[PDB]
Structures are given as structure tokens and as C-alpha cells.
Amino acid sequence: IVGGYTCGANTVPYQVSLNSGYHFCGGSLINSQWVVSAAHCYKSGIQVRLGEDNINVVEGNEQFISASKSIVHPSYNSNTLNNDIMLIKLKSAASLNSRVASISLPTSCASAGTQCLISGWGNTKSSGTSYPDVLKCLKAPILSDSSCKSAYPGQITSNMFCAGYLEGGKDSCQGDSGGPVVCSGKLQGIVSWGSGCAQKNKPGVYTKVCNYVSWIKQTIASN
């Protein structure tokens, strides 16, 4: 997260860290046994880390649970990042509490102008690299589809939305991948891609979760 703020320990209780010996992606806990992340975060041997603030210090509220199954969206296109969404089933159900909690799926899509919370342990610099150990937060509006398509001609599908600031300086970044965009208490986005980070006229592009609720629900019901 570039230009964000320190969330505060466990203030984003649905935020997960995907760990393969190191943090490599974020995710969102959507029920006690399922995590949603980005398909471009797919790899084998994922441990899901819940209740994290400092990902380098055991602080007392963590739950470390291995993934038993990962399901990349059937139409994920890694070249275009269309349908950049994946489900991860935990080997055992997480213990839900005030600091580890699921985030609700949307019943409707959020409109441009809605303010959302984006969070992650990604890079905090737009040039160079500095990775924080504690969770960073960014409040950002959803941008209109027209401004989104104008920033990224030919690259925005109906399964994507832009959020952020056309003036730059505030954005998600590498390592925030797969993490949540939460608007009015609902998971509306997944950190997916962007041109660099926090660059002028290059807002973040997010997977449009409301388009996948039926797939998510059907998949969880049968797996």
C-alpha cells in the first residue's frame, strides 16, 4: 500500500496473508473455511495466516492453517488478468472472533464514488521498495468505468473496476495482490493489477467480486 496508513493490529479481521515460506499475497476470509484471493496468487503449498498484524512477529492472535484445495476461476486468463479470482479452502475451519472474522460477499455491485478500504502488506513505495511488516490501509473511491477505461485503454473488462486516485500517490502495490477491497462492509474487490504503483492516471485495477458471487457460492457449496 502506497500512501496509506497503519491499520492498527487486527482492525481488518478478514485480512489474510498467504504464506509459502514468506508472505506473497493477501486474501479475504469469507467464511470459517474459505479464503478469496487473486488467481494470479495461485501456487501450491499455501499456508493461510489469519489474525496477523506484524507478519514477522508472533503477536498472539494468529491462526496458521494450511490450504487443502485451491480453485482458480475456470475462465482466469493470466495474460489479461480477466477473472482474477481464486478460492482457497482451509484444511480446518478458522476460529472466528473479533480479530479473525469473515467479510460478507456483496449482494449488489458498488457504484463509482463509493469509498472503500484496501489493505495489505505490499510495497509502500512508488519508486524503489520498502515492505512493511504491519498491515497498511488505504481509503480509496471506486472510479467510474469511463475513467477506468480511459486510464487503461483496451484492458478493462466487465470483471474489473478501478479504485484510487488519478493524481497518484495512493494505491495498492506488489504484495497487496489478492487482498480485499471492502466497501460498506462488503467485499467488492480483489487487489489485481496496475501499471506500477501510485502513478498518475494509473489507478489500481480490482477484480469485481459482485460478478462472481454465484460462482463463489456454488463452489463453496460443493467443495
Q: Return binding residues for Ca(2+).
A: 52, 54, 57, 62
CA dist 202 and 123 (Å) reads 16
Known active-site residue 53: no
Smallest separation, CB 10 to Ca ion (Å) = 10
> Which of the ranges 51-59, 104-112, 120-128, 197-205 carries the binding residues for Ca ion, by CB under 5 A?
51-59
| Cα 113 to Cα 94: distance, rounded to the nearest angstrom | 34
The secondary structure of residue 142, as a DSSP letter, is B
Does residue 177 have an active-site annotation? yes
* Shortest reach from residue 176's CB to Ca ion, in Å: 17
Catalytic residue chosen out of the listed positions 40, 73, 176, 192: 40
Edge-to-edge strand ranges of the sheet holding 160-163: 5-6, 136-141, 115-120, 180-183, 186-193, 204-208, 160-163
| Subset of 52-111 contacting Ca ion (CB under 5 A) | 52, 54, 59
Shortest separation between residue 23's beta carbon and Ca ion, angstroms: 10
Count the residues of the shown chain that bind Ca ion, applying the rule CB under 5 A. 3
* Grid coordinates of 154: 483496451
- Tell me how crowded residue 89 is: count the other CB atoms within 10 A of its CB: 16
Helix (H, G, I), strand (E, B) or coil at 193: strand
- Which of 48-56, 128-136, 161-169, 198-206 is the region at the interface with Ca ion (rule: CB under 5 A)? 48-56
- List interacting residues with Ca ion (CB under 5 A): 52, 54, 59
